[PDB]
């Protein structure tokens, strides 16, 4: 078929900046047969630019589309919060149609210190026989973060599940849940649990911990 690569795959642009992304195809594509679709993280794909130049119904005019031959570009004059989505180019020069790899556009912002919160296993889950220690890191930029789970002053790896949130719609920050699920025997055999988060915002990592016999 015709392979289309979109560069860059993931990009971060400050609010109000000018954004340009490119969609390069293996062969030449006739400009009438290459389109762009914008997909919000939670929603379905939406038609954005059709035939490389023309905006679909209900599309702001700050969106520009150029390109001919093997290279095509979608340009935004002024970046806005509502513009943060994924963009897919779509070619139909020859059957079968193929889609690009997608360009993930994210909003840049000033760095913010995360809020770290620890949670001992709940009573109901303790009754069931399980024990999970949940750590919440909320409202931090950028997306990169380091988490180490300490049990009695020793690192733990088994059962550590790290989950990242997509960028927030309001303050363009991220969130993370670090879950350490262990058996009841392993929970009751140990005393103190420490959640440590190392971030670019602060040189000193943020430490939050609790002890079973301390209250």
């Amino acid at each position: 078929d015709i392979v289309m690569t979109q560069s860059p795959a993931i990009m971060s642009a400050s609010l109000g900046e000018r954004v340009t992304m490119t969609c390069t195809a293996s062969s030449s594509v006739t400009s009438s047969y290459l389109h762009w679709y914008q997909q919000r993280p939670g929603s379905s794909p939406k038609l954005w630019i059709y035939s490389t130049s023309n905006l679909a119904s209900g599309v702001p005019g700050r969106f520009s589309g150029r390109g001919s031959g093997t290279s095509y570009s979608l340009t935004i004059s002024s970046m806005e919060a509502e513009d943060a989505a994924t963009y897919y180019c779509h070619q139909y020069h020859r059957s079968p149609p193929t889609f690009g790899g997608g360009t993930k556009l994210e909003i840049k912002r000033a760095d913010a210190a995360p809020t770290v919160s620890i949670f001992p296993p709940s009573s109901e889950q303790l009754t069931s026989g399980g024990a999970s220690v949940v750590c919440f890191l909320n409202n931090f930029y950028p997306k990169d973060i380091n988490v180490k789970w300490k049990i009695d002053g020793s690192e733990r790896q088994n059962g550590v599940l790290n989950s990242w949130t997509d960028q927030d719609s309001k303050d363009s920050t991220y969130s993370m849940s670090s879950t350490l699920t262990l058996t009841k025997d392993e929970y009751e055999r140990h005393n103190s649990y420490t959640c440590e988060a190392t971030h670019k915002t602060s040189t000193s990592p943020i430490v939050k911990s609790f002890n079973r016999n301390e209250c």
Partner: peptide
């Protein structure tokens, strides 16, 4: 002409 449009635009 179709190829010319394809490679350099209409």
């Amino acid at each position: 002409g179709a190829a010319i449009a394809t490679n350099f635009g209409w």
